[PDB]
Amino acid sequence: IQVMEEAPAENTADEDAAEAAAQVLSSVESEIGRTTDPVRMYMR
Amino acid sequence: IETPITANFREGLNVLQYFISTHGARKGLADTALKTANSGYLTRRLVDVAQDLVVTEDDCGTHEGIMMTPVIEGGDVKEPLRDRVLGRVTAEDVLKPGTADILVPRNTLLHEQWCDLLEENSVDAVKVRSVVSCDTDFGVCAHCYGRDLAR
Amino acid sequence: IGLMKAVDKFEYRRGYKFSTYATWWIRQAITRSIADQARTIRIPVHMIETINKLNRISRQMLQEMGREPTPEELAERMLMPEDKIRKVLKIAKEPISMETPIGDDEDSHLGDFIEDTTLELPLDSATTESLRAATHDVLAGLTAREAKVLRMR
Amino acid sequence: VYSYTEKKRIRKDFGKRPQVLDVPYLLSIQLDSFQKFIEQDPEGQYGLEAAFRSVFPIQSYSGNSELQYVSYRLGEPVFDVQECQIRGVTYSAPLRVKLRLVIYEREAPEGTVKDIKEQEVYMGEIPLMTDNGTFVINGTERVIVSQLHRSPGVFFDSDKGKTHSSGKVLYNARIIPYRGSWLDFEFDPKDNLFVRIDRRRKLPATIILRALNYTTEQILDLFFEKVIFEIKLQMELVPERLRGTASFDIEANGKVYVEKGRRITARHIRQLEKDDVKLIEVPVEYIAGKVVAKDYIDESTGELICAANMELSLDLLAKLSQSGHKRIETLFTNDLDHGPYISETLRVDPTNDRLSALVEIYRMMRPGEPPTREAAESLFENLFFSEDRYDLSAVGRMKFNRSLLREEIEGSGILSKDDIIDVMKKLIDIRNGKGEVDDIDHLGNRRIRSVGEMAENQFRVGLVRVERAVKERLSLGDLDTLMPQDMINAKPISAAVKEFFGSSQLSQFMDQNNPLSEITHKRRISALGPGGLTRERAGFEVRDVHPTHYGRVCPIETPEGPNIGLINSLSVYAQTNEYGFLETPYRKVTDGVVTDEIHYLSAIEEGNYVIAQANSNLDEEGHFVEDLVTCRSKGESSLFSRDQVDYMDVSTQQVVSVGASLIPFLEHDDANRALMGANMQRQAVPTLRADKPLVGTGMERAVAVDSGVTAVAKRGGVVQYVDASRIVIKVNEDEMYPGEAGIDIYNLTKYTRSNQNTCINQMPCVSLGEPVERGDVLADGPSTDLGELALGQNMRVAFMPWNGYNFEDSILVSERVVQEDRFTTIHIQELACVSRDTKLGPEEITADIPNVGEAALSKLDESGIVYIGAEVTGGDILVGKVTPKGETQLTPEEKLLRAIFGEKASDVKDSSLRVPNGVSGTVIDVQVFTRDGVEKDKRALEIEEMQLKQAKKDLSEELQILEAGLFSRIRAVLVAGGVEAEKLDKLPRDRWLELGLTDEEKQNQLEQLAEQYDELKHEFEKKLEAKRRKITQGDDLAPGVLKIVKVYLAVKRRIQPGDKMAGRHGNKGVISKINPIEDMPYDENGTPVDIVLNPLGVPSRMNIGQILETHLGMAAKGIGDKINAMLKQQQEVAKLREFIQRAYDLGADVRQKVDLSTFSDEEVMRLAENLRKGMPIATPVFDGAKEAEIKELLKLGDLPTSGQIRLYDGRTGEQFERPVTVGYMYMLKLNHLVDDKMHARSTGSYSLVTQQPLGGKAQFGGQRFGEMEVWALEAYGAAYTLQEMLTVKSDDVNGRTKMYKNIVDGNHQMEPGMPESFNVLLKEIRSLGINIELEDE
Amino acid sequence: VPLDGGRFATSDLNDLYRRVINRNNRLKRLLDLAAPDIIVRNEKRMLQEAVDALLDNGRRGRAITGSNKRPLKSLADMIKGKQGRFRQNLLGKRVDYSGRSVITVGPYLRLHQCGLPKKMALELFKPFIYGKLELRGLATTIKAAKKMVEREEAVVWDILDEVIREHPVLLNRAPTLHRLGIQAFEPVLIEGKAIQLHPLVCAAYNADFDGDQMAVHVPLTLEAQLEARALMMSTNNILSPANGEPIIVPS
Ligand SMILES: CCC[C@@H](C)[C@H]1CC[C@H]2[C@@H]3[C@H](O)C[C@@H]4C[C@H](O)CC[C@]4(C)[C@H]3C[C@H](O)[C@]12C
Ligand SMILES: CCC[C@@H](C)[C@H]1CC[C@H]2[C@@H]3[C@H](O)C[C@@H]4C[C@H](O)CC[C@]4(C)[C@H]3C[C@H](O)[C@]12C
Ligand SMILES: CCC[C@@H](C)[C@H]1CC[C@H]2[C@@H]3[C@H](O)C[C@@H]4C[C@H](O)CC[C@]4(C)[C@H]3C[C@H](O)[C@]12C
Ligand SMILES: [Mg+2]
Ligand SMILES: [Zn+2]
């Protein structure tokens, strides 16, 4: 996908990558306090 | 813009007409660059796809091919048969328009003399051997390609 | 780790506030580290102390001189033989990144312009083989025993 | 009346339109800005005063102590500009600020203070700007270009039916502060307003209103109007409200007003208003869909019957009626115009109270932290509304108030509830069709920031950092005997300034090809830089040319490449307002008369007038001649009646820049070629002798003088002394300043190196006793001739093919052009030799070098440095140096060889400086810098002695010439009031100051005071002498270097095939051949042609200004050849006065009028000797010479009016058919020399990690062979060529030495091997966890 | 690598390796002190982060920066990218025996010949000149030959004219858009510093004479010379490979 802070070059993504990204994307919503930061984990 | 520039360069453009012309100039200058960058993308992608295709055989021995006829868009003909058929190899015998006998037997590279003969007989449908329908494995044969076009 | 060191060496009988028999053991351990593993080219704790002292004595001299001090005035203000100051003022700062962008033409990095100085030039490798031959000629043009004498010597 | 320098050579001027406004100083954008920065403003609003007042005073915890700012000053720079350049150090002044620490004691905080400590602290050095708009940073001259950025304020924009499949237009609104956060108000496709705080997640707009202590009632009162209802069931009717499709038509007075079904029209409203309708009865169902306005409660039990903003139904109406409620309120909302966008936002509002809103904002900004009432209130109150963290500058308030249609320009720099509500109302009105969005390309929405502003914004940053540090320091202790000197360290403050001036995108090396490049570099506007755009995200919207550029930004001159349209040039008359907006002058027109008073209008202020064109014929009294005159209204142009115009363009040049206004016949060139021509004219290289243009536009003198390459007279006078190096002017008595000596000295800049390694040389253009006035040029700089810019040479050119030697754009040149040195240039380069101290011992500079056989040691002196004046060539030694090497380990045959011949090891290297191969010049300068501890070898002492002698001689010559002027003036004063004439000269010179005057006693005390003042001046000059003998001080050489020796070589480059030449019309080419003179085409008189150009290049490239320039140059040179003849046949002035007056009077209603009847005879003959090589001609940009005038001028000389003569072939003598076009064209030598572009490599040095040929010419690198060339070789069958290009020629380490040995053996065969780009790849993959290995055959 | 003035330049991998080693040593030391499990868990997390930054920096974390604010370059960053080895170096490297210059017309030339500056050729063909000098007895050894060519003796020009006699050179113009952007020519030694290009070849290169430059390479092996003469020579390539029409038409 194109972040493009502004509104708008070909597709080369394997479906396997696609399906896996979809599943992890679903998990993000179901997540509660996922933290990928050591200092933050340490404080907690 | 509805009003044109009614002056030419032998005369002079006044300041307003020159100010109008500046837009077109800068637009063209900015375009050219985009065109260059976009033609490079296509070429890189097309050599990535087709880099390892090589002529690896002399004659696969197939009997199939495309059917070349002149291309006509409604009115006149914009590409005759000679341009489309020159330099290729026939897949089937080109029967004389009277259906009498074979004009070019088969597997004949159609050089200029043969094309002149075809124009003489006014035939407008020739079946030629094509790369896309070659029986060779991992490569292409010389007869399904045609001729070099540079040699 | 300094905190662990404190807890094991703390005596409550003297009634010291820990939060004080530790706030030291902790700072000693942070500074010892910042000195022993903060630079790619390790410097002794003594040299680091000296460099920090000079960088300070220098700030004060600049504020009261409206001008950077001179290796001579630094030596005078400090207690150093002047040449020692220049040696400590040479301890190169941290190595530069070899990927530092130096571009605007081809996107080339700084490490691309650093040459190899331990390489033999090809006219010196051809010259060497030419001598290794010529020697065979002038020597062969001699009798066996003397030629072998020269070869062995 | 003509100027002295301009009466020596008057340029004939076409150009029928008169001049009302003279061209301005072309460097006032740079010089005004920095004066406003470094300068003292009482009402501190500009420069450093503003920053100090904005940061100081600094307050610590509990206000126990305060640090007040009093003033500031700048000290004198230690080194002047020339010493800064020679010594390689920044030219700057030290900033010293007097602060005051005040301490508050206990008891009453706001009362007596313990003590006040006042102290001056030195806080960094600020670079100073030269008198030409440049800075010296590290000995190099820099230019800091201006920046065009978007102005702070409120801007309403939309999506123009984009990013929406439906095609709906979503409108937005953004507040942009000078420094702060970006508020916003955008529309969701469901028509709901959502404010985005800092590019964060959007939330409904109403949240913010609730965060501003607003209730729902107040929100509705502000946004919606009110519809009242009474309870039978009567409603008050307003005729205007029911404009119109109604459920119930009307029921007023019972009888009739209008039937049902029919929509209400205008006439119905007219009848209702005429009948005074105020109360009506309507069915209950009509209110079935409305919304109650305010909260309605029941008095029986004090229960809430219905809250505000709730749909009203029949049951609620019945309950209210039976509960005693008669007055029921609702809200208006016609979907067509006054639609409802706030109501939905409230209904979808996740907030009911301010605290919840603050908590939500807290989570959005910094999610995950425990929200707290005090913390959230503080965060919101600090985000905006805080002077420290949010500034809406004076320009921002003006562009905000004006956008919302307020009457106050002045205001507060912080937001408020009123401002936000008004922004919301304006956006809603836009969404309702009232109003329009803004164009973000309009030069009324773009601002210019120049060096003073950018520099003060970086000083304020440093001041903020230091203020934070000081606050921290005073947060603890607050002890006494703490002066304000230990708290302030200068490095943090100076870091920002040094980094900005040194390494920044807008601070760049000045262009010193010629005067034009400097001038055009200084007045340049860039859209890049910090706070601006970037190349990747620019898009073509901002690269276009807008209608508002007219007269402000040049549409022609812009680079062609990655950033075209992002960098522009300031137009000739364009100037900046008090707020940073380009504005341009217009000549005011009263009812009918075109007055002569100019108003400077801005881009937006100009939209609502009708401005006539400069080429608009006017009568002798100012009235427009034609009934209808073409003018440009708001956006477009069209004819207007003469009686409804109010402004007129001030000139025909005011649209173009200075570079594009130097092209004659610009109207006849295609725009692409004009762009190319301006860009190339910026690149011309000055030549040994300068040549004025024969065909110019009149802008040459302005560019030459407003650049500083020339010496211009400050005050008038008579030239007392002239020399190749200085000029001494004896000023007129009218401008003496009685305290002065009366003479001024100009020191010319002799051969000196520019940033492009060209030569900077000034030579005088006056003579002894020659009367000068103020503004007259005294010495021409590079590329100037008698005060006029002169970038090239006048070449005799013929347009014809000639044998394929001008095939594409190639140029054929004569050998007479190369013999006469017309395009020979001087290039100065400097080389350095540094002697460092290695680990094995210091390096030495010596004349004794190992393995050098006295062949290349002749030019060196006894100290090891070349003599000054030596003619060196490639490979010669300039400075002889040796480096200590240790050990060797001789091979087994190198030991035997050393034995037989008994030759021992040198033990030192030969790391000496030598001339780069291919260069050949003379050494014109050598300078040596040594550390403090080093011995200052003999040559260094010689140079120091020479410097001391030169400084003493110059200072003493200054003092004695000034004394001579002083004594002469005193003698002149002594002619009256006790005059001695014969006896005055008898007494010695020293007894002038003791000469008496009228008798008195107070006069004697003044005499003694004057003697004391004179002795003090003597001591002053003596101490100056002492100071100068003191720059014998050691140098601040970088660490590890003992000394540096710099040598300056002056090469003289001639013209040769491969050099690039150009005209002023975008016609460039490469010289292809230098042709003998007997082989060039010639005319019937035997004169050959200098240059032969190809005609086929003109038709396709529609730049036919070069043909007209050639014809007019032929005419001008014809006039010049008829004067050479009369001056060589020694004819009388009467005859030269008649002809030279017939050529200065030719034309069709031209504005110029030269009267050669007021000229002396000595002045008619000095003009005729300056016009004997061609009469100069001026053809303004869009007011040029008509072709008929060119024909007439050709006829004044004896040349054919066709412009074409008949030529003969020099090789055969046969005349060409169909005569050819010959004339004179102005050619430039562009700075693309084939000397600097030819490079060949066989073998050289290699890179360390990727052992590949190095890259470049200095490194003597190789050629890059990339993918598209690999594809080309694969398209052939060239597999061996590819293999040897990939391995043996690039990075096959042991396969490249074997190839060399094989080549020198006559055996052309390779053993390729494996590239080292693959071995490194294997090691890098293997140093991950992967195991990649080469499989056995 | 040491630089001038005592400065040192280092690769970013040294920083990452030092990080990994420091955290590993600290973890080993901390395991022997029987520290509370919070400390050892945090140390193990740090070690994991350091190793992941070494192998692939900023793939899951945010990043790691050095003295500057730029992210450190990791092992994965040295293979991938548009600058990585698997790209840049391996098909787009610098080459020996090459040089560029400006092009002029030279209308007197034949289609198989190009004008080459004598000075550019005395450098490109240097080893050939040394070999042919030593083979004719002009120079006793190779150092002698190096000084003879350095002094530019008279015999050196004759030897150069002999070396260049039949030895093609490849000429290439910037955007190689098709295979006619590299072609082989026989050199003709000329004065000056600009290459002369036969007019009829310009259309193939899309080249004009207003400042354009060309690169020249010299084939070394016998096979490379034969390929230049038989495959790439300009007189063998007069038809366009796109269409059989001639590409050498007068312009
Ligand atoms: C702006 C483009 C980047 C590049 C041109 C700039 C950025 C940082 C600069 C280097 C560093 O300062 C460290 C050293 C300082 C010494 O004094 C001279 C060498 C040294 C390597 C510098 C040369 C050059 O100037 C550098 C590489
Ligand atoms: C356009 C960017 C400028 C770039 C080409 C300039 C700017 C600084 C220069 C380097 C520094 O001097 C540090 C090293 C000094 C050694 O002696 C030679 C290599 C070294 C990298 C220099 C080569 C080159 O000259 C550099 C990279
Ligand atoms: C009344 C007019 C005075 C004027 C003619 C006299 C007064 C002082 C004289 C100059 C100074 O002596 C300094 C230099 C001395 C050198 O020897 C020759 C040049 C030099 C500039 C002199 C030229 C001339 O002689 C000057 C200007
Ligand atoms: Mg070109
Ligand atoms: Zn086939």
UniProtKB/Swiss-Prot annotation, chain D:
Protein's GO biological process: bacterial-type flagellum assembly; bacterial-type flagellum-dependent cell motility; cell motility; cellular response to cell envelope stress; DNA-templated transcription initiation; intracellular iron ion homeostasis; nitrate assimilation; regulation of DNA-templated transcription elongation
Residues annotated with N6-acetyllysine modification: K1017, K1195
Origin superkingdom: Bacteria
Free-text description of this protein's post-translational modifications in UniProt: Acetylated on several lysine residues in the presence of glucose.
Record keyword Hydrolase present: no
GO molecular function, one term: DNA binding
UniProt key word NADP: no
EC nos: 2.7.7.6
Listed result of changing N672 to H/K: Resistant to antibiotics salinamide A and B
Enzyme class: transferase
Catalyzed reactions per annotation: RNA(n) + a ribonucleoside 5'-triphosphate = RNA(n+1) + diphosphate
Entry keywords, A to Z: Acetylation, Antibiotic resistance, DNA-directed RNA polymerase, Nucleotidyltransferase, Transcription, Transferase
Biotechnology: Co-administration of salinamide and rifampicin or salinamide and myxopyronin suppresses the emergence of resistance to both antibiotics.
Matches recorded under CDD domains: RNA_pol_B_RPB2
PANTHER family for this protein: DNA-DIRECTED RNA POLYMERASE I SUBUNIT 2
Subunit composition and interactions: The RNAP catalytic core consists of 2 alpha, 1 beta, 1 beta' and 1 omega subunit. When a sigma factor is associated with the core the holoenzyme is formed, which can initiate transcription. The rRNA transcription and antitermination complex (rrnTAC) consists of RNAP, NusA, NusB, NusE (rpsJ), NusG, SubB, ribosomal protein S4, DNA and precursor rRNA; S4 is more flexible than other subunits. In pull-down experiments interacts with CedA.
Family: Belongs to the RNA polymerase beta chain family.
Role of this protein: DNA-dependent RNA polymerase (RNAP) catalyzes the transcription of DNA into RNA using the four ribonucleoside triphosphates as substrates. Resistance to the antibiotics salinamide A, salinamide B, rifampicin, streptolydigin, CBR703, myxopyronin, and lipiarmycin can result from mutations in this protein.
Record protein name field: DNA-directed RNA polymerase subunit beta
Organism: Escherichia coli (strain K12)
Swiss-Prot record, chain E:
Subunit structure: The RNAP catalytic core consists of 2 alpha, 1 beta, 1 beta' and 1 omega subunit. When a sigma factor is associated with the core the holoenzyme is formed, which can initiate transcription. The rRNA transcription and antitermination complex (rrnTAC) consists of RNAP, NusA, NusB, NusE (rpsJ), NusG, SubB, ribosomal protein S4, DNA and precursor rRNA; S4 is more flexible than other subunits.
Coiled-coil region(s): none
Biotechnology: Co-administration of salinamide and rifampicin or salinamide and myxopyronin suppresses the emergence of resistance to both antibiotics.
Described function: DNA-dependent RNA polymerase (RNAP) catalyzes the transcription of DNA into RNA using the four ribonucleoside triphosphates as substrates.
Similarity remark: Belongs to the RNA polymerase beta' chain family.
Species, as recorded: Escherichia coli (strain K12)
Protein name, as recorded: DNA-directed RNA polymerase subunit beta'
Lineage of source species: Bacteria, Pseudomonadati, Pseudomonadota, Gammaproteobacteria, Enterobacterales
Post-translational modification: Acetylated on several lysine residues in the presence of glucose.
Residues that bind Mg(2+): D208, D210, D212
Transmembrane segments: none
